[PDB]
Backbone:
């Protein structure tokens, strides 16, 4: 679906409302903003490979712009000039204080709020790569991913906001509908992730 | 003179042997729907039947 069909469907299923059209757009943007703030991150918010170049003597690497969380089946990889690389390992900061002053290529990291820290402090310019989840407004794609894959969740959320203002009771029905849609979306993500994969112990 | 007894012995042996043949093989009972099948049919040493 697209924005026009979304607005038309939201207006139709809210009681064939016709006067309001701008509030629907406002609460449709706010619905996506609210959904991005919750704990569950769908698969379509995963970014592409991004590389960072940094100066010598700074261990702090700022977090990417729309960082929500990192991707577990992924890693921060140091790409050496020759094209080879190693995967850096995450530990807590307390655990990485032994290394201050030991010298060499970077080998470990910690995330403290807005910054990634490379504790084996490089003495020369480096380059790292990362895969992580991002807010949509910052992805490079053509259309909001949400519109294509999560359209029915969005409709319900918008209808809930609008009705909630009117103080209607119907709102709790649409919140239950949205909760069911998100529950199904989680199972769909799990099924997509695990397809054609065989697990061996050890 | 011993024939009548010998037979009792053959009967005992044969019965035992015929009952073992019928039931002593490892076999399992299960619900086909709940599992992915190709996984069940593998003899690899460590395998997770998903």
Residues:
């Amino acid at each position: 679906m697209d924005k026009a069909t979304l607005v038309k469907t939201i207006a139709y299923r809210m009681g064939n409302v016709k006067g309001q059209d701008t509030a629907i757009d406002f609460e449709l943007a706010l619905s996506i903003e609210r959904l991005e703030g919750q704990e569950f991150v769908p698969w379509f918010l995963l970014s592409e490979n991004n590389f960072f170049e940094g100066t010598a003597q700074e261990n702090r690497i700022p977090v990417p712009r729309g960082f929500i969380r990192e991707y577990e089946e992924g890693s921060l990889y140091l790409r050496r000039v020759a094209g080879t690389g190693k995967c850096l390992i995450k530990k807590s900061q307390d655990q990485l204080l032994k290394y201050e002053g030991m010298t060499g290529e970077p080998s470990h990291y910690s995330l403290t709020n807005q910054y990634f820290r490379i504790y084996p402090v490089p003495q020369e310019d480096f380059k790292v790569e990362l895969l992580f989840y991002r807010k949509s407004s910052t992805l490079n794609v053509e259309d909001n991913p949400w519109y294509e894959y999560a359209a029915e969740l969005l409709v319900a959320e918008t209808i809930w906001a609008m009705l909630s203002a009117r103080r209607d009771k119907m709102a709790d029905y649409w919140k239950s509908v949205a909760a069911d849609q998100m529950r199904r979306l989680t199972i769909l993500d799990a099924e997509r992730r695990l397809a054609n994969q065989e697990i061996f112990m050890g | 003179i011993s024939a009548p007894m010998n037979d009792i012995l053959t009967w005992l042996f044969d019965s035992h042997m015929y009952n073992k043949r019928q039931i002593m093989n490892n076999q399992f009972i299960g619900d086909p729907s709940a599992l992915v099948v190709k996984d069940v049919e593998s003899k690899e040493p460590g395998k997770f039947i998903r």
Observations:
- The CA atoms of residues 16 and 47 of chain B lie 38 Å apart.
- Chain B touches chain A through six residues (CB under 8 Å).
- Residues 3-23 of chain B form the longest helix (21 residues).
